[PDB]
């Protein structure tokens, strides 16, 4: 007598949201927001450098914990909480900008500056920087006056970047523990260090005095830096208090840099990283970490946004 048309239905449907309505039930649906984290750094196929106890900026100056990182190569660079940029207490001016340059440098390659000296000492060391007894930063030289209280002669040194990419130049300023202990090392009078590149002019006068004992030591070294363009020259005028670069760095290519506290895993592949690990997903969104970096789903505040993949469920 008859023929009737219909459609499929389920007992268990999935509720979703529409323009018009909250929680309409459909046959099937699928998630658009990623919540599944992999608690490792997924490094499969990637030249990876885990800095561990080496600070990223310490790769340029070379305290002992960075000795095996002086000329690294990488697609992926990892910083760790335990890392430290210094052996002798001190810090970098414009520290974060430098880190950013280095995170995407592809690693570094080092080249002798070619400074030589006369009328002064070049081998200054300390108990903070340990390599079979007292040492210093591997890429630097602690310049002194030959003997105690001796006049540090006003010095002029230049270096032309002969290469086709910009040179990274780094030099330190030593602030001794007192006004007396400064004159001992470099002689009395107002010391003056200056620096001049085509698009860079600056001056540096020291500042002796008592800082808190870090590594048991109350002295500090101010590290500074510039990017020296191809064929450009840079000159250092100094009456003292100066930590001299021995080598200059050049950037190898491209990389990314992350901060994290989890292990590396070469069985695992991913392009989106954060401090807790790797987000592997094709979903367009994620609700795991808004500071995730690399190539990532967009961060959203919602835990979940289900997308209908079936008709409306209308059961018996």
């Amino acid at each position: 007598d008859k023929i009737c048309l219909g459609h499929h239905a389920v007992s268990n449907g999935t509720k979703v949201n529409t323009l018009t309505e909250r929680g309409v039930e459909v046959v099937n649906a699928t998630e658009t927001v990623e919540r599944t984290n992999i608690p490792r750094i997924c490094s499969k196929g990637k030249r990876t450098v885990d800095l561990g106890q080496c600070g990223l900026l310490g790769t340029i100056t070379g305290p002992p914990q960075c000795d095996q990182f002086l000329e690294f190569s990488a697609d992926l660079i990892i910083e760790r909480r335990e890392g430290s940029d210094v052996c002798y207490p001190g810090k970098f001016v414009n520290e974060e900008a430098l880190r950013q340059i280095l995170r995407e440098s592809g690693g570094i390659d080092k080249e002798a500056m070619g400074f030589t000296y006369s009328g002064i000492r070049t081998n200054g060391a300390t108990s903070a920087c340990r390599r079979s007894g007292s040492s210093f930063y591997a890429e630097m030289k602690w310049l002194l006056s030959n003997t105690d209280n001796a006049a540090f002669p006003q010095m002029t040194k230049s270096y032309k970047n002969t290469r086709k990419s910009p040179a990274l130049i780094v030099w330190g300023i030593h602030h001794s523990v007192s006004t007396a202990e400064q004159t001992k090392l470099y002689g009395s009078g107002n010391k003056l260090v200056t620096v001049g590149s085509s698009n860079y002019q600056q001056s540096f006068v020291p500042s002796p005095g008592a800082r808190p004992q870090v590594n048991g030591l109350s002295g500090r070294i101010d590290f500074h830096w510039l990017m020296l363009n191809p064929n450009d020259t840079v000159t250092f005028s100094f009456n003292g208090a100066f930590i001299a670069p021995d080598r200059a760095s050049f950037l190898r290519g491209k990389s990314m840099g992350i901060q994290s506290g989890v292990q590396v895993d070469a069985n695992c592949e991913g392009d989106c990283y954060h401090s807790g690990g790797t987000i592997i997903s094709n979903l367009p969104f994620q609700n795991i970490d808004s500071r995730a970096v690399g190539k990532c789903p967009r961060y959203v505040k919602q835990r979940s946004l289900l997308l209908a993949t079936g008709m409306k469920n209308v059961p018996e």
Partner: protein
Amino acid sequence: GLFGAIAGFIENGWEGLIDGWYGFRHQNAQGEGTAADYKSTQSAIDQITGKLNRLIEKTNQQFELIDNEFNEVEKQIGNVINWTRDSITEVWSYNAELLVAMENQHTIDLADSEMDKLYERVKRQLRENAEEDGTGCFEIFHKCDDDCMASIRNNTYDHSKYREEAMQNR
């Protein structure tokens, strides 16, 4: 939905229809039976999977660190960054919410549409040899045996053969 079939002039779905999305369940002089319409099922499936491939993809756009978890950046520049990131979160959380909502509306209407398209095809096949019940059913005046019903499902039902018969049986 917009086409008023699913959750409309059809009362409900069939849990027994595991064979496909849309289908037929006939009654005749030989008993009741059911089957699935491949074509209508496929259009709906294909359109829906087409939505997915389009949405389930990540961009090749790399983003890098501009702040620091282990060593806080200067506060001023830090607050500008946070404000910028939070502003971007607000845009994307809005976008995702609107995307899914409007996609779901279309999905549901689209599935309703396909059911309506199937219903209307059949109506047009039968011509004045049948009538609209109103629950999504066609009362047939002439005798459709199982052979008859299969001809409808396959788009081969010749209305002229049974016309005289069913016109009389009004």
